[PDB]
Amino acid sequence: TLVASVLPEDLAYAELYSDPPGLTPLPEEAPLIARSVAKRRNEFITVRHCARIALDQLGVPPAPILKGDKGEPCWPDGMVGSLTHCAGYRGAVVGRRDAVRSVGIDAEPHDVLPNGVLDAISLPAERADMPRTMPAALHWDRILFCAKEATYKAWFPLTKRWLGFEDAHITFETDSTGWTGRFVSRILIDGSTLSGPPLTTLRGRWSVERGLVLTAIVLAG
């Protein structure tokens, strides 16, 4: 799998690169996409099948994954997780909450960002400093965006607050060999959480492989 390259039972994952035919949502999930276009129905159904495959590894029976007020997934009791879909990818990573406080993941096509998007998703020091810490000709701008998305998805279940692109400073390193490495997201705003200690730094991993960027953050419980 692609997502295993960005991950450290208590944790499980599943991914697919297409939408297998004949997949259906659970009855509780069907209303959420009753009037949705085909592409949305397909990604929604496939990513939730991945989530149920991953949850099954952790001993959890198949259950619907509904969405909260800010779109966040609703996990079975005692579980945490994250979902992502982009062209050519559906993925789910789930964790046992006693050992895993939060998960955030993201996948994007490994392409340059469209013109204008970089300025909307980055901080000035990231634009200045990140290219030197990253392997050449890789789309560091797209990787930064993915790191911002994994950061928000790991952040939101714990704070239930907005995190803007300007609210976290992300610094990168590259592993000795290959197209992978670590990143650290430092929250610049108050990181108070619903329970437990406040969020300050979130450590994650990034990977470029098979035309996709993957990022993931797994916060220890």
Ligand X SMILES: CC(C)(COP(=O)(O)OP(=O)(O)OC[C@H]1O[C@@H](n2cnc3c(N)ncnc32)[C@H](O)[C@@H]1OP(=O)(O)O)[C@@H](O)C(=O)NCCC(=O)NCCS
Binding site for ligand X (CB under 6 A): 44, 47, 67, 70-73, 83-86, 106, 149, 153, 156
Determine which residue in the list 19, 126, 149, 167 makes contact with Mg ion, applying CB under 5 A.
149
Site for Mg ion in 70-99 (CB under 5 A): 85
CA 118 → CA 91, 107, 113, 140, 162, distances in Å?
24, 17, 7, 10, 20
- Binding partner of residue 47 among ligand X, Mg ion, ligand 17I, none, CB under 5 to 8 Å per kind? ligand X
149 marked ligand binding residue: yes
The nearer residue to Mg ion, 101 or 142, going by C-beta atoms, is 142
The pair of three-digit structure tokens given for residue 63, joined into one six-digit string? 């259950």
Closer residue to ligand 17I (CB): 7 or 123? 123
139 is in an annotated binding site: no
If phi > 0 it is left, if psi is from -120 to 50 it is alpha, else beta; for residue 10 that is alpha
Closest CA to 82 of 91, 15, 100, 212: 91
H/E run at residue 100? strand 100-109
Q: Is 160 labeled as ligand-binding?
A: no
Torsion-angle region of 108 (φ positive above 0: left; ψ -120 to 50: alpha; else: beta): beta
- How near is the Cβ of 148 to ligand 17I at its closest, in Å? 4
**Runs of H (alpha helix) within 87-192:** 117-121, 124-133, 140-159
109 binds, among ligand 17I, Mg ion, ligand X, none (CB under 5 to 8 A by kind): Mg ion
Choosing from 18, 112, 211, 220, the residue that interacts with Mg ion (CB under 5 A) is: 211
Handedness of CA 40, 43, 49, 51 (dihedral sign): negative
Closest residue (Cβ) to ligand 17I?
A: 152
Evaluate whether 185 touches 145 at the Cβ level (below 8 Å): no
Q: Provide, rounded to whole angstroms, the least separation between the CB of residue 113 and ligand 17I.
A: 13
Is 97 flagged in the annotation as binding?
Answer: no
| Residue 114 burial (CB count, 10 A) | 8
Binding site for ligand 17I (CB under 6 A): 148-149, 151-152, 163-165
Give the C-alpha separation, 154 to 215, whole Å: 11
Binding at 165: pick from Mg ion, ligand X, ligand 17I, none (beta carbon under 5-8 Å per type): ligand 17I
Q: Give the binding site for Mg ion (CB under 5 A).
A: 85, 106, 109, 149, 211
Binding residues for CoA: 40, 48, 67-70, 84-85, 106, 149, 153, 163
Binding residues: 40, 48, 67-70, 84-85, 106-108, 149, 153, 163
